[PDB]
Symmetry: C3
């Protein structure tokens, strides 16, 4: 039984030119790329993305930092929502575990490279916000017999 999560490379991931390295970390576990799109995030879409943080003092600066090129992604795998969060590490890179993306690449929460859905509910909502359905691709990995039980 697999699930899908929404992962987004933030503008610092694009500008520091580590997109391929990020993707390789998820491919290495046999997670399937179900969707991938480069766009430029705008305030209106970012306000919906970060709707839970509406009204807060730190939202305007977050929206400014996120206004930039992003790579929207959907990955599929066993427990991939929680696992992708674990692989990203803590929001604050200084608290993130060695070997996580944020610990290996970053210094501060405001420039922490990547976003990942925090729950099944947020994954459904975020995939619907950033992708049209035709952009979610269904296919099977040829190495499935060696990735799954």
């Amino acid at each position: 039984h697999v699930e899908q999560t929404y992962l987004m490379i933030k503008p610092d991931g694009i500008q520091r030119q580590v997109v391929g390295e990020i993707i390789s970390r998820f491919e290495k576990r046999g997670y399937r790329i179900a969707a991938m799109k480069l766009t430029i995030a705008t305030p209106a879409i970012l306000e919906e993305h970060y709707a839970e943080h509406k009204g807060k003092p730190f939202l305007p600066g977050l929206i400014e930092k996120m206004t930039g090129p992003v790579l929207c992604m959907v990955f599929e795998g066993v427990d991939v929502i929680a696992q992708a969060r674990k692989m990203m590490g803590s929001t604050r890179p200084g608290e993130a575990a060695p070997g996580t993306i944020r610990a290996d690449f970053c210094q501060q929460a405001g420039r922490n490279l990547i976003h990942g859905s925090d729950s099944a509910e947020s994954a459904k909502r975020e995939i619907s916000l950033w992708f049209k359905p035709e952009e979610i691709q269904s296919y099977k990995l040829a190495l499935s017999d060696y990735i799954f039980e």
Copy 2:
């Protein structure tokens, strides 16, 4: 004092073609390759290898998943039995620590890439099961003065 452990790349490690990456992780710590052999594991030898799991519900499926090409290895180093187990990570990849082999490469316990001895007694037994003594090679690493105290 150094010891020797038995490490085996399972058929998923062969088929996903990550043998070299696995070997490099152990070489990186200055662990010495003392033996290495590609074979195809058969139920009879696997039954002896996994004798501690006799009767357990997962054993028949484990033997099936392990019937395939494997790379038998012996590595030598300080505390290498416990250390290699730490590098492998937990049986479940989802529970394994970031930076371990199972967390970095795998999703599920039944396809978790690598076996390693869990104790001095099991290392002795497993090395003897899979290797004849003439297959164990003794040499000294040229960088020994910079690896060992």
Copy 3:
């Protein structure tokens, strides 16, 4: 607000020829090289470097193992003193967390690849010990906007 820490590649890092890999780990987080110098450490400077261990049993052997080529480094970043210590891992490689330098490269405390300042006071002292002020270089990373909040 950034700070500067003193990092030193020990003779085993030089001789095992992993200098570039070590530097890449710190560059990967956007830490800035503020100073760098290859020298051959002498007992006199090592006595002052390791003054806190004066009288201790392992000191003379530590000085001996450290009498050789070293790479003196100063790296700048947010919380970089504590963060570089986290990235190095525990003194004993066998106790260091997976994904740290010492866990990924080493076996024993006497050959654990790298030194890093352990506090703000020690970083100031160690930088001044190994570098003259003229050797410390001030410049801005062009990716600063994508590294720092």
